[PDB]
Design a protein around this ligand. Structure first.
Ligand SMILES: [Cl-]
Ligand SMILES: [Cl-]
Length: 162
């Protein structure tokens, strides 16, 4: 298992524009297009992203390509974040994947908001962190996904994904 497979499981794959759990236009493997309520605005951002007139539909390879870029950016963004880097650096490979998943979903700013949980993760207090991570809008809105990521930080294994 790895970051790609893990997010593929969490996000799924859709080749037509769809609305995410928050009602925002998305496509592919969790690629957010826009928070604007307008479908045209989304189609437009989509064409700009693919470099062609898609008419709201893309192929698998195009989806995968957006995905690759999205994962790379999440990593790079973690590495540039003063609040995130030290945490990421302190973690083992499996848990690093949980941190990436979270940035992929919520953005760097969103995660930077789990200040208390981050400190716990850095100190390696797994059970306490898990409990704190659960006290969040994140967990109440997407509980199944959240539990998977939390178990991963708690155990350091991929068991929640097997
Ligand atoms: Cl893009
Ligand atoms: Cl969920």
């Amino acid at each position: 298992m790895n970051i790609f497979e893990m997010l593929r499981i969490d996000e799924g794959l859709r080749l037509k524009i769809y609305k995410d759990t928050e009602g925002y236009y998305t496509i592919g493997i969790g690629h957010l297009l826009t928070k604007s309520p307008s479908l045209n605005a989304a189609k437009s951002e989509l064409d700009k992203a693919i470099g062609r007139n898609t008419n709201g539909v893309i192929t698998k390879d195009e989806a995968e390509k957006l995905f690759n870029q999205d994962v790379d950016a999440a990593v790079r963004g973690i590495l540039r974040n003063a609040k995130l880097k030290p945490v990421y650096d302190s973690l083992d490979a499996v848990r690093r994947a949980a941190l990436i998943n979270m940035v992929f979903q919520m953005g760097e700013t969103g995660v930077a908001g789990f200040a208390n949980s981050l400190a716990m993760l850095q100190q390696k207090r797994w059970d306490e962190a898990a409990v704190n991570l659960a006290k969040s809008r994140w967990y109440n809105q997407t509980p199944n996904r959240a539990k998977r990521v939390i178990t991963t930080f708690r155990t350091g294994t991929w068991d929640a994904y097997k």
